[PDB]
């Protein structure tokens, strides 16, 4: 039996990438309650007329 | 018509009635006014839906 040191025995591992994405984020569900509007300048102004 | 009842002597002449009811109609009004200048120089389009 060859008495190898501790560091050499610790280097004798194989790298596996099964844990790559970590834990996935929660589902996205903001489109159900919000209205999406695109702005083109410094700010948007909205205006409506009373009855 | 009155309800039929047992006949003993001679017919007893009875009475009916009549009713009436009248509904009188009324006149309703609504008016708004805006300046001519304010209407004409309206590029936004906020005063369009008044009609």
Curated annotation (Swiss-Prot), chain A:
Stretches assigned to coiled coil? none
Induction entry: Expressed in the late phase of the viral replicative cycle. Expression of late genes is activated by the viral late transcription activator C.
> Its domain of life?
Viruses
Protein's cellular compartments: Virion; Host cytoplasm
Q: How does it assemble?
A: Part of the immature prohead complex. Interaction between the viral portal protein and the viral protease I may give rise to an early 25S initiator complex. The scaffolding protein Z and the capsid protein T should then be added to the initiator complex to yield immature procapsid. Host GroEL and GroES are also essential for the correct assembly of viral capsids.
Q: According to its UniProt entry, what is the function of this protein?
A: Capsid protein that self-assembles to form an icosahedral capsid, about 54 nm in diameter.
Its name, as the record gives it, is Major capsid protein
Q: Which organism is it from?
A: Escherichia phage Mu (Bacteriophage Mu)
What gene does this protein come from? T
Which part of the complete protein is shown? 1 to 51 of 305
């Amino acid at each position: 039996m060859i008495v190898t040191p501790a560091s050499i025995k610790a280097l004798m591992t194989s790298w596996r990438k099964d844990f790559q994405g970590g834990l996935e984020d929660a589902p996205s569900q903001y489109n159900k309650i919000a209205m999406v509007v695109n702005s083109s300048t410094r700010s948007n102004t909205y205006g409506w007329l009373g009855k | 018509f009155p309800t039929l009842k047992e006949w003993v002597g001679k017919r007893t002449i009875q009475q009916m009635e009549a009713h009436g009811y009248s509904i009188a109609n009324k006149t309703f009004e609504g008016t708004v006014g805006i300046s001519r200048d304010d209407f004409e120089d309206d590029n936004l389009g906020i005063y369009a839906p008044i009609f």
